[PDB]
Amino acid sequence: SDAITIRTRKVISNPLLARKQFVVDVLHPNRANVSKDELREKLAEAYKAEKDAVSVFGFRTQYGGGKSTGFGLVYNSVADAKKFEPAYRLVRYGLAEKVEKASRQQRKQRKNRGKKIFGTGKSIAKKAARRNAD
Amino acid sequence: GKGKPRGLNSARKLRVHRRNNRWAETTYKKRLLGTAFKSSPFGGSSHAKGIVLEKIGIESKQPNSAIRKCVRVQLIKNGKKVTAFVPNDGCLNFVDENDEVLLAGFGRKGKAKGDIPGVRFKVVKVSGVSLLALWKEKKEKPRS
Amino acid sequence: ARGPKKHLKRLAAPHHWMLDKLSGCYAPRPSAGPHKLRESLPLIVFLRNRLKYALNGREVKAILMQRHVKVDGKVRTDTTFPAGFMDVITLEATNENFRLVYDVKGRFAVHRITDEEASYKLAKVKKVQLGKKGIPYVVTHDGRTIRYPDPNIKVNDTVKVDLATGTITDFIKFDTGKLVYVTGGRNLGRVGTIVHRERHEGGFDLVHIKDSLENTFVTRLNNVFVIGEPGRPWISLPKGKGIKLTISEERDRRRAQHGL
Amino acid sequence: ARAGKVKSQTPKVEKQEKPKQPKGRAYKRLLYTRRFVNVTLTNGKRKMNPSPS
Amino acid sequence: PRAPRTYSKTYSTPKRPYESARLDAELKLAGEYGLKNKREIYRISFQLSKIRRAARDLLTRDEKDPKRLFEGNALIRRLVRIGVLSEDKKKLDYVLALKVEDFLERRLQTQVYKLGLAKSVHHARVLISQRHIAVGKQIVNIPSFMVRLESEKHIDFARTSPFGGARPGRVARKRAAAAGGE
RNA sequence: GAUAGUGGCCUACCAUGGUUUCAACGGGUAACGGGGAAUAAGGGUUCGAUUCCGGAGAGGGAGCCUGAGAAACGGCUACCACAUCCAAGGAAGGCAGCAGGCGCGCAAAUUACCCAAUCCUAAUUCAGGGAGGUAGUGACAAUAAAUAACGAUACAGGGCCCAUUCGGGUCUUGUAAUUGGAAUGAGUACAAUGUAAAUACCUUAACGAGGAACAACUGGAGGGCAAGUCUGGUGCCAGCAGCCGCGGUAAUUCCAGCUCCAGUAGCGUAUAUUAAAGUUGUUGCAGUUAAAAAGCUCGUAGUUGAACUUUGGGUCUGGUUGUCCGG
Ligand SMILES: [Mg+2]
């Protein structure tokens, strides 16, 4: 069945980001891709810390199951995770959300047009209305 | 006594000798005098493209004597004229003259092939089609 | 051209930074700083590559900005900083400190050190003159300069600099029978003693050097650097003693007690 | 001109649904077994091309 | 741009195109070996050829130089590891005459064969070629694999690939439900 | 004089002289230069447009400001070129930057998504970057192999028991064009991933192999050079064909078919260039006739040169080998 006994290798406990880094090996048995959130919860049992104190990513399997490899970061607390840990991973975890960045072409057009205008021109707008009215 | 000097201060005369006698084996001459680009209207072109003028057939040479299914083409990339061929019995009337054509060389390096007099080029692509298609009826010829 | 360079490919790097020939194609141009570029080590590279503490460029900038690293007490917020030679790099968090000491074969290696010796630096003499006011002063190719030097020290010697203020605690002259050290090219990175103070003037002083095991060789001068008295050099060099051993002894040592 | 004739006189025989030649690894196995098992029933020399005619 | 990636060819086309004795020899290698094609022969050949080049310029110099005493000993260590030569011949000079067939001796085609559970070697080709294996539990996929001479004892069947602790699978189950279960 | 400065760098006044047949500038380069690539006994011959290292260039040519730094070009000025909007009063421009189009060609793709990587930028961690990142167009080359495999049968020559003939003839192909389960990825798809978005794999729920099928291919089948006088048609025309030579009334070559024959997602064709070439030979050619000994000498330049000076005897050994029952 499933009944995995997870493990980590190459454990490093580094306060330079107030965290620990490890590589996670996971057992497949007879169940494909053990489903990140379950790994997160099992780690919550393992380090006995707060559940959200785990960001594990980068899984690959063994070409016919068996085990799978990932890299896992356990922040000592939510804080530094919130602060420096880049947005995207937290987005996908569901803790924090993902801003609407205006699409690449959108932002480019916007900034170029803003280039073309000198000073917030309320005056030029109403002046143009008046003049092209003539 | 092996009239090439051998004394242990030779290097200069050896080089000048060998590099004033490279000029025998023609391949060297063609590459360096380069006329393979000046003349030979297919400027080192493993192919070319041109247009048909009007089909002609020239008498062949010794014992093998027959009409040998000849064509007259003018290139486009420089504006020069040659005489080419059609293999694969039929398809000599896939011409539809004033249609363009894609030419390629033989294998005898501009020296003639087999029996034909003064001819250098097959044809494997033409007007967007390859003769292997129609003559095996894989594709179908669009008209120009 | 038409001015200097700011961008550095992943290739024209010196071998000794231990690159990876994959994972991107733009390697850190170390900041134009004290040492020479083509030998300098970049701190970011020191972290992601060897330490593997920061896992990403943003991680490096992150750990720097919050100021837990110090180049000899000094902060040096920047990434592309040129960390140098036998210097002191303090990580107050983790209560650990590092010394830029060479390994055997020729590339930079980690080494923890005792807090005691972490106090100071062991730098090379380059020049001594008198400037305006005729004041005496010394320039070390390890960046710093010191004004009012100890008087006797002529060119090409070793000065122990506190870095706590900018003051000398001792120095070593340049003689035969002096544990000496090299930073030179094809045989870079070897502990030694001067067996002969070969001169050959007119250009590029040369030194003949015995190892500890009587295996001599020759190096150009400037790339030599004295390191301590016989039987006692001041720094605490790593395992290896810069000997450039034989390949077969290496394989025997590597695979003798095979559990690794 | 008068060319384009042979295919006009040719018989227009059709293909024969013969069981597939087991293309691939089977092909090498078959050539081996056929060529190098049966040394008997010789044809003067082992003529590879014996016809029913 | 990116750090350049590199080539390496692994077969060559012999100068003589077509001469019988060869042709028959390789077909026979297939017969006692189960080859897919002749590419396996050319690759094993080119590998052999560079091995021989190595040994030739090894023995060209004098002896007792460290160059041989290191690289030759390491090369023969590699080979005695894979399983082509035999221990009684650790003299680097049988290496000049490996006689291509010998490499082929150690392919899981015939490695399974002479290990059995193969039953007319091409049935071993069936088993190995698609995922009906077990080697290191790294379930191999290409039988040009060169067992490391010690993991060979692990060679068995995985948790797929039934008769050895699996479930029938995707046809047999179809018919078991169709008739056996009913 | 100018230059951050040396200097015929420029100017004045004298000196008038450097250059080389161990190649001067000239002319061309289908050449930016090079670390390298192909080639495979050993020398060597050719390619270097570029993943690097530099160099030069951003219509072609002059001049300049700014700035530590530019003769810059996503900075500007200005001639002759390209030229983009009008109210006939100058007007924004320079894609050899990304992505597409334009004419041209033997011919090269998407007006893709992105700053998570990589790092780099300027007041700086956040902001910025068609630099580049993730995908599509991707048979320019590569590496790995899916193209079914095993059983119960009713046969031949020989494997094997003997001889008129139980077959104790048990393997084979010929072939059965008998017969059954076994097993799959090729393809389809929820899920976890996986790349932040985004390949795809990998796992993978489930579907999905029993013959047409989920269908191998291009070239040959006279000699190299691998297998045909087996069958039909055409018959000096057609067509073949790298060479030879097949074409003129049974083609063993054509046109088909069948049977065979190579490599296997690959193969042939086409051009340039390497081994074979010892037909560029320096290591390695020939020179009486065949591809030439200048008609003979002189005779500068290189190119080469007679022999002859410390032998020889003694020197302790410094270490190592043929080395000395083998620890
Ligand atoms: Mg299966």
GROMACS .gro file of N, CA, C and O in nm, chain D residues 1 5-6 8-9 11 18-19 21 27 29 37 43 45-46 49 53:
model
   68
  539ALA      N    1   0.936   1.254  -7.777
  539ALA     CA    2   0.805   1.274  -7.837
  539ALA      C    3   0.728   1.144  -7.837
  539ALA      O    4   0.645   1.121  -7.750
  543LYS      N    5   0.565   0.530  -7.381
  543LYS     CA    6   0.488   0.421  -7.438
  543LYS      C    7   0.490   0.296  -7.352
  543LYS      O    8   0.387   0.229  -7.340
  544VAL      N    9   0.602   0.267  -7.287
  544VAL     CA   10   0.617   0.139  -7.219
  544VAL      C   11   0.506   0.121  -7.116
  544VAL      O   12   0.440   0.017  -7.110
  546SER      N   13   0.226   0.249  -7.133
  546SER     CA   14   0.100   0.226  -7.203
  546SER      C   15   0.083   0.079  -7.239
  546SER      O   16  -0.027   0.025  -7.225
  547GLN      N   17   0.189   0.012  -7.284
  547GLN     CA   18   0.170  -0.129  -7.314
  547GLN      C   19   0.181  -0.219  -7.192
  547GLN      O   20   0.147  -0.337  -7.200
  549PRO      N   21   0.137  -0.456  -6.884
  549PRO     CA   22   0.028  -0.518  -6.810
  549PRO      C   23   0.007  -0.440  -6.681
  549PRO      O   24   0.102  -0.398  -6.617
  556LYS      N   25  -0.008  -1.069  -4.970
  556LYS     CA   26   0.064  -1.177  -4.909
  556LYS      C   27   0.090  -1.143  -4.764
  556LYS      O   28   0.109  -1.026  -4.731
  557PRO      N   29   0.090  -1.242  -4.675
  557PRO     CA   30   0.105  -1.211  -4.533
  557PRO      C   31   0.230  -1.129  -4.509
  557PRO      O   32   0.333  -1.150  -4.574
  559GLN      N   33   0.561  -0.930  -4.425
  559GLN     CA   34   0.696  -0.968  -4.387
  559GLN      C   35   0.723  -0.912  -4.248
  559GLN      O   36   0.719  -0.790  -4.228
  565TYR      N   37   1.264  -0.987  -3.866
  565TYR     CA   38   1.322  -1.004  -3.999
  565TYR      C   39   1.461  -1.064  -3.990
  565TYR      O   40   1.494  -1.158  -4.063
  567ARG      N   41   1.573  -1.237  -3.734
  567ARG     CA   42   1.563  -1.374  -3.685
  567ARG      C   43   1.527  -1.469  -3.797
  567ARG      O   44   1.582  -1.580  -3.806
  575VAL      N   45   2.025  -2.298  -4.108
  575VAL     CA   46   1.984  -2.421  -4.043
  575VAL      C   47   1.989  -2.540  -4.139
  575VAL      O   48   2.035  -2.648  -4.102
  581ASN      N   49   2.158  -2.733  -5.422
  581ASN     CA   50   2.122  -2.703  -5.560
  581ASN      C   51   2.245  -2.688  -5.650
  581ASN      O   52   2.256  -2.592  -5.726
  583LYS      N   53   2.535  -2.560  -5.601
  583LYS     CA   54   2.567  -2.477  -5.486
  583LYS      C   55   2.436  -2.435  -5.422
  583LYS      O   56   2.329  -2.452  -5.481
  584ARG      N   57   2.444  -2.380  -5.301
  584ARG     CA   58   2.321  -2.337  -5.236
  584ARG      C   59   2.269  -2.216  -5.312
  584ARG      O   60   2.303  -2.102  -5.281
  587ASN      N   61   1.779  -1.886  -5.487
  587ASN     CA   62   1.667  -1.841  -5.568
  587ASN      C   63   1.611  -1.958  -5.647
  587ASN      O   64   1.624  -1.964  -5.770
  591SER      N   65   0.945  -2.336  -6.184
  591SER     CA   66   0.936  -2.327  -6.329
  591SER      C   67   1.038  -2.415  -6.400
  591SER      O   68   1.043  -2.420  -6.522
   0.00000   0.00000   0.00000
